[PDB]
Structure 1
Amino acid sequence: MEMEKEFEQIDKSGSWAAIYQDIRHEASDFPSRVAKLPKNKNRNRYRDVSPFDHSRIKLHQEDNDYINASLIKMEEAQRSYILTQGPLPNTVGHFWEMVWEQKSRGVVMLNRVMEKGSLKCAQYWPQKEEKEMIFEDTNLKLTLISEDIKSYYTVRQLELENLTTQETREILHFHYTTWPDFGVPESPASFLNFLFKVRESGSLSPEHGPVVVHCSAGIGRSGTFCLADTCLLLMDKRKDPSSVDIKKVLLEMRKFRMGLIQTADQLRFSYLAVIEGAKFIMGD
């Protein structure tokens, strides 16, 4: 069924909360035993959001390999993503270790450091060129190279240096700064504009490691981003674009991280973004 007609059907019958609960009921349940070990309690921002064991990213260190992060590998679309929580004061060094070890080119941040008067993640990148950051636990240095502030998002060029070997890499930081404190955006236009800027940079392409995407818990706004990207790519690849089933794609992604898309409003917004984004992938 054309999602656009599916959309109006659900909208006129006001059944979004019902569709969404059906997804929650059918979603995969896999063990997350490593996340729950006592030694890792201060590595998790939220007690009820954990990576599954089978898909978790392992840090390359004998001490403790745990980070709250998951590899979402989409086989038909030929795209991979790493979804992670916003880094905590004691996990910022682990976060940049993962970026280095997984050979990522881009980091996508979908939250502000403070929202609703509370801290939603650590200030984990430098704000001034001349004030670089050193992460002593993982032996990495991080420098701000340039900053381009736009109305709906900011793009930063960063230099990550492995102090052990003195190799350096350019990392691109894509910061969507205008998601509202409550609810979802009224129009998907600025979100789609942002997605296409990430695509244009190379950060999603198979020559690099997977993009790292986060919000506060790494499941809500973050799920919306990868769900929309993968659905649009499938519509590009297939002979029959109306065969793309957004609910089935979401359940496939939930095999790799729990709780992706956190509200029925985020589900509706994901439909809106794919429907409106389609009106480019087909030529215009």
Structure 2
Amino acid sequence: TPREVTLHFLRTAGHPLTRWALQRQPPSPKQLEEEFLKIPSNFVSPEDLDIPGHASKDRYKTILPNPQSRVCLGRAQSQEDGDYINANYIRGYDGKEKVYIATQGPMPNTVSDFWEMVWQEEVSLIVMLTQLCVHYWPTEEETYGPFQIRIQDMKECPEYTVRQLTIQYQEERRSVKHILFSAWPAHQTPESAGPLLRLVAEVEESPETAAHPGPIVVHSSAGIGRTGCFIATRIGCQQLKARGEVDILGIVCQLRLDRGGMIATAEQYQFLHHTLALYAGQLPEE
């Protein structure tokens, strides 16, 4: 029943706020921290995961992908026998399936796994959140297992770099857009929310380039704190734009059902409210 209690909370908690309340009368910092601390982590224990050999492919022993939503790799790697990657499908706006994949930053031994996921899930956009983990993309051209990656273009913006990559598997070539957002330390927040919202706009402006729409890959070293903050921000912006309201509690609860631990800190939860209040004031009108 501890698990039942956890799952019931995450399915039912909610604090919808009109855009006016968000902008002009938000909950206090102490209210937001108390609210955040009530949310169950929904972390899976190593004992809950029966996937032999998975440990060598996790950056952090206690940060594991929930089994019901984990990404399983197909058999495109002739070198390895398992289907394991530390990554989860994440629902988006109104619970839409597989809008994102949240994953840890690749380690040297999981770089081929990462590109296999990108290929198999027809990913066309990767969002990386860091404070400037191995570089898994080339300066010019590298081969990772059966995948050749080449940089086609690279452009610099304030606080993010856009790379346009090509991924080749056999005679097939695909385009992948890669955005590296570079001033977000682990367990903390950016000093301002302006750049983050430009990153959100960059993401929204990105064309679909795959055969079928695929998840957006979002990662940061653990795949939960900054990763969770980014996805929550995008979903929150979508709610504000479509409905003139936002339920940030319910967004974080929906993310935690998909991957344990999403949004790592009360300060991050507070910054999420600030960022969304900023998005609300930037919305078009008079």
Alignment TM-score, normalising by the size of structure 1: 0.84
Structure 2 gap ranges (5+): 1-16
Q: 1:34 to 1:102 in 2, by over 3 A?
A: farther
Tell me, yes or no, if the aligned pair for 2:23 and 2:281 is still in contact at 8 Å.
no
1:153 aligns with 160
**Corresponding position of 1:72:** 90
Fraction of identical pairs, as percent? 32
Q: For CA contacts below 8 A with separation 6 or more, give which structure has more relative contact order.
A: 2
Q: What whole-Å deviation, never above 9, does each CA across 1:192-233 have from its counterpart, x for those lacking one?
A: 011101110125999520110000000001101110111111
Q: How much has 1:169 moved relative to structure 2?
A: 0.5
Deviations 1:39-96 (CA, angstroms, capped at 9, x unpaired): 1111000011111111001101282000000001236264710000000110000000
1:17 to 20, 25, 33: 33
2: CA distance, partners of 1:234 / 1:125? 33
**Structure 1 stretches lacking a partner, 5+ long:** 115-120
Helix, strand or coil at the partner of 1:49? coil
Q: Partner of 1:44 in structure 2?
A: 58
Structure 1 Cα separation of the partners of residues 211 and 182 of structure 2: 27
Note if 1:226 corresponds to 2:231.
Answer: yes
- CA offset at residue 281 of structure 1? 3.7
Distance 1:16 1:142 in 2: 43
AA paired with 1:41? A
Q: Does the CA-based 8 Å contact 2:87-2:102 persist in structure 1? A: yes
Contact 2:126/2:216 (CA < 8 Å) preserved in 1?
Answer: yes
- What CA deviation, in whole Å up to 9, does each residue of 1:103-153 have, x standing for no partner? 0111100014x6xxxxxx2110012x3xx11112xx111111111022211
Matches of 2:276 and 2:27 in 1, distance apart?
Answer: 16
CA–CA separation in structure 2 for the residues paired with 1:125 and 1:193: 23
- Structure 2: how far apart are the matches of 1:204 and 1:180? 31
Length, aligned pairs only: 263
Cα distance between partner residues in 2 of 1:74 and 1:213: 13
Compared with structure 1, are the counterparts of its residues 133 and 205 closer, same or farther at alpha carbon in structure 2 (3 Å cutoff)? closer
Deviations 1:143-180 (A, max 9, x none): 111110222110001110003xx100010010001224
Pairwise CA distance, 1:15: 4.1
Query: Which residue pairs with 2:124 in the alignment?
Result: 105
1:32, distance to aligned residue in structure 2 (A): 6.9
Cα distance change, pair 181–53 in 1 and its aligned pair in 2 (3 A): closer
Against the structure 1 CA distance between its residues 15 and 234, is the aligned structure 2 distance closer, same or farther, given a 3 Å change threshold?
Answer: closer
Q: Matched residue of 2:258: which SS? A: coil
Letter in 2 for 1:208: P
State which of 259, 262, 266 in structure 2 corresponds to 1:260.
262
User: How much is the aligned-residue C-alpha RMSD, in angstroms?
Assistant: 2.6
AA of the residue aligned to 2:273: Y
